[PDB]
Amino acid sequence: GICSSAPTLGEIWKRKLNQLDAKEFMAYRRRFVVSRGTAKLAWIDERGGVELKGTVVDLGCGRGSWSYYAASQPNVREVKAYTLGTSGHEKPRLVETFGWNLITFKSKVDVTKMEPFQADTVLCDIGESNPTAAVEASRTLTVLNVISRWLEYNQGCGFCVKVLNPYSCDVLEALMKMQARFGGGLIRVPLSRNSTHEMYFVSGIKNNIMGNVTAVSRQLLKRMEE
């Protein structure tokens, strides 16, 4: 059922991606593809994928693009942003914005160990691409398990969460369980490069997760022959 087709197609996409040489990879990744991070959240926002409101938590905020964006939105009251920011990782970048005083950045935080607290909107763009899909899958599952406790703690909240590898069988199963508990759906942002299969688990759109994952694999494969 759930794992009959999607893991196969995604793994073909990954193995074919990994066979592209430097010039091929550069040409492919941009083919028909529409800061990159701000633009992605903005696109999801404008399509109704997440109601940005109340207290917004940004888990793994990095340089803070999503936090700055959320803090500029009219129904947002506060942004609490957390990131690792230690050696090797992105740390919050300070900019002069009218939303400046709505944001609190906290560095040296392991968000996998933070207890959940009140949030009207849960945002998380965590997931570092890796050539091994299994590595990406365990990263994706870690993010989803973390996000589950926030969505359970905050019944009815909005959310927009990156799913780095959405075609792995264990990820699909975790996603079906989450859609069952918390509703929502899984969307592809057209600004995403063809070199990532990243999709976003969002509160404001209801859809067929498996069908969308497979449609994305088939589109990314098609673009690779074009």
Side-chain angles (χ1 to χ4, degrees):
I2 291 169
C3 301
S4 47
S5 171
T8 298
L9 293 165
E11 286 170 49
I12 293 162
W13 166 85
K14 190 77 176 185
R15 287 194 308 270
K16 294 188 79 154
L17 180 74
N18 283 341
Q19 287 172 1
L20 301 173
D21 75 12
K23 286 178 202 153
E24 296 173 321
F25 178 88
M26 292 311 292
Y28 170 63
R29 79 188 311 221
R30 72 180 74 174
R31 199 167 297 130
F32 319 141
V33 167
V34 168
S35 84
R36 292 185 176 76
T38 302
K40 285 154 75 187
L41 186 56
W43 188 96
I44 294 165
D45 191 18
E46 306 169 18
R47 313 303 149 130
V50 63
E51 180 176 2
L52 299 169
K53 76 175 160 67
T55 300
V56 173
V57 180
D58 190 3
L59 304 167
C61 68
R63 47 178 206 269
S65 277
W66 278 27
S67 285
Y68 280 113
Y69 179 88
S72 292
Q73 298 319 117
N75 306 125
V76 167
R77 304 168 77 79
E78 189 183 358
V79 182
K80 302 163 106 161
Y82 304 84
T83 204
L84 197 43
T86 57
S87 185
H89 304 87
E90 287 300 284
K91 33 194 282 291
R93 200 176 65 91
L94 295 179
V95 294
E96 45 285 332
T97 164
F98 283 141
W100 72 280
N101 52 299
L102 301 193
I103 312 157
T104 306
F105 286 112
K106 203 195 167 62
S107 273
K108 292 170 175 56
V109 178
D110 188 351
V111 308
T112 83
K113 294 182 176 169
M114 275 200 296
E115 274 176 300
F117 54 69
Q118 202 279 321
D120 300 293
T121 308
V122 174
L123 303 179
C124 181
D125 196 37
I126 288 170
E128 191 179 14
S129 292
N130 186 278
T132 309
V135 172
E136 297 183 316
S138 57
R139 290 175 183 177
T140 300
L141 272 178
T142 292
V143 168
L144 295 186
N145 290 344
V146 172
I147 291 314
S148 280
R149 10 211 329 255
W150 285 84
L151 305 187
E152 186 65 26
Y153 190 103
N154 295 290
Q155 294 306 326
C157 73
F159 54 84
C160 176
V161 175
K162 187 199 181 163
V163 189
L164 172 63
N165 176 348
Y167 55 79
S168 173
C169 183
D170 49 7
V171 171
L172 284 166
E173 278 172 336
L175 280 172
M176 292 312 284
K177 283 177 185 145
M178 294 167 76
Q179 188 186 42
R181 296 166 73 181
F182 322 117
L186 193 71
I187 61 157
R188 170 75 170 179
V189 181
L191 291 50
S192 285
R193 281 162 177 150
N194 301 324
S195 55
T196 178
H197 209 297
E198 68 186 8
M199 292 169 80
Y200 286 85
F201 181 47
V202 291
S203 46
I205 292 151
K206 266 170 138 49
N207 71 7
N208 185 324
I209 291 187
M210 173 206 60
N212 231 268
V213 177
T214 65
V216 165
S217 301
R218 296 191 184 274
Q219 173 199 63
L220 298 182
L221 291 164
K222 189 169 172 72
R223 290 178 179 189
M224 220 185 139
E225 45 210 8
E226 294 192 305

